[PDB]
Design a protein around this ligand. Structure first.
Ligand SMILES: O=C[C@H](Cc1cnc[nH]1)NC[C@H]1C[C@@H]2CCCC[C@H]2CN1C(=O)c1ccc(-c2ccccc2)cc1
Length: 306
């Protein structure tokens, strides 16, 4: 029993973190095979960041303008190219700890684990969701750029995030591993701000199913709702509209608990209208939205408690 935010074991990623230095900037890169991936702003000073031109900044560097460290070993760069917002550096050695892996662009609402690194050295791990406004509520200090996000299935690591910047509200933005930002953000130190965010409805429902699988049913009710009357209520409380594809996604959880997804939407609609009356769900006093349906099935018993 119990339900916690849970990150994937981080060993396979820890064996890929390195340190990358260009001039006086140092940050983290990701060493798979014979490439090292890192934020392309490692080639910038503080002042360049106001208005950089990366193409023009990069033609000015050589292979030996980049220093790559892996533990105590110096790795020798033999090639470099820019890919959108990342650099790929080719190094003279193939990472012997490279895991089976793939690169994925995750979609708002999905979750992943982040290995926070400083100077190529892993310091912590936590789980977070991609918000609808394309930020994440990370925990990151200066020097954490190049820290990655990932999911693990079987033995295969799906890398899906690289950390590039922190926004004024204290949220974090970054890219996939082909260098394309998540959201409307760019690697320029120019006024930028998180767009308004929304509660991830699919996840709240998934988490209410969790609560039922463990054995708690206090927040259910006798009512059902149409999809459409749900949404009139959802918008008013700044929840994402529920779509039929989100309803189909919840099928398995609906089936494990015998609660119909709309019936759960009526449960939620009533939670939104009345509060929780000082009660809790899975230990929380507030509706939680950073567990996906897949996160609930992965963590919960396949046998409902009742
Ligand atoms: O390496 C980590 C940081 C990101 C981060 C820090 N804390 C959590 N995450 N890298 C931020 C870098 C690069 C980034 C690229 C996108 C546009 C914003 C920049 C911000 N970065 C700077 O180098 C930077 C640091 C400090 C200031 C600053 C300091 C004092 C007053 C105003 C600005 C401006 C830029």
């Amino acid at each position: 029993s119990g339900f916690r935010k849970m990150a994937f074991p981080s060993g396979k990623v820890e064996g890929c973190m390195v340190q990358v230095t260009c001039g006086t900037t140092t940050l983290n890169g990701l060493w798979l095979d014979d490439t090292v991936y890192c934020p392309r702003h490692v080639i910038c000073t503080a002042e360049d960041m106001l208005n950089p031109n990366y193409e023009d900044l990069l033609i000015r560097k050589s292979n030996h303008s980049f220093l790559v460290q892996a533990g105590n070993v110096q790795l020798r760069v033999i090639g470099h190219s820019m890919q959108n917002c990342l650099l790929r550096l080719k190094v003279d050695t193939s990472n012997p700890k490279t895991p089976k892996y793939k690169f994925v662009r995750i979609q708002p609402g999905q979750t992943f684990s982040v290995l926070a690194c400083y100077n190529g050295s892993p310091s912590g791990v936590y789980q977070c969701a991609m918000r609808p406004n394309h930020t994440i509520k990370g925990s990151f200090l200066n020097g954490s750029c190049g820290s990655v996000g990932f999911n693990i299935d079987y033995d295969c690591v799906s890398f899906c995030y690289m950390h590039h910047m922190e926004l004024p509200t204290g949220v974090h933005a970054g890219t996939d591993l082909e260098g394309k930002f998540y959201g409307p953000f760019v690697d320029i130190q120019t006024a930028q701000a998180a767009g308004t965010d929304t509660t991830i409805t699919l996840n709240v429902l998934a988490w209410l199913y969790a609560a039922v699988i463990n054995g708690d049913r206090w927040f259910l009710n006798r009512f059902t709702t149409t999809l459409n009357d749900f949404n009139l209520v959802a918008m008013k409380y700044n929840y994402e509209p529920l779509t039929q594809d989100h309803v189909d996604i919840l099928g398995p959880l609906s089936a494990q608990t015998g609660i119909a997804v709309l019936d759960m939407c009526a449960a939620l609609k009533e939670l939104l209208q009345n509060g929780m009356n000082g009660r809790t769900i899975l230990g929380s006093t507030i509706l939680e939205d950073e567990f996906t349906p897949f996160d609930v099935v992965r963590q919960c018993s396949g046998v409902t408690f009742q």
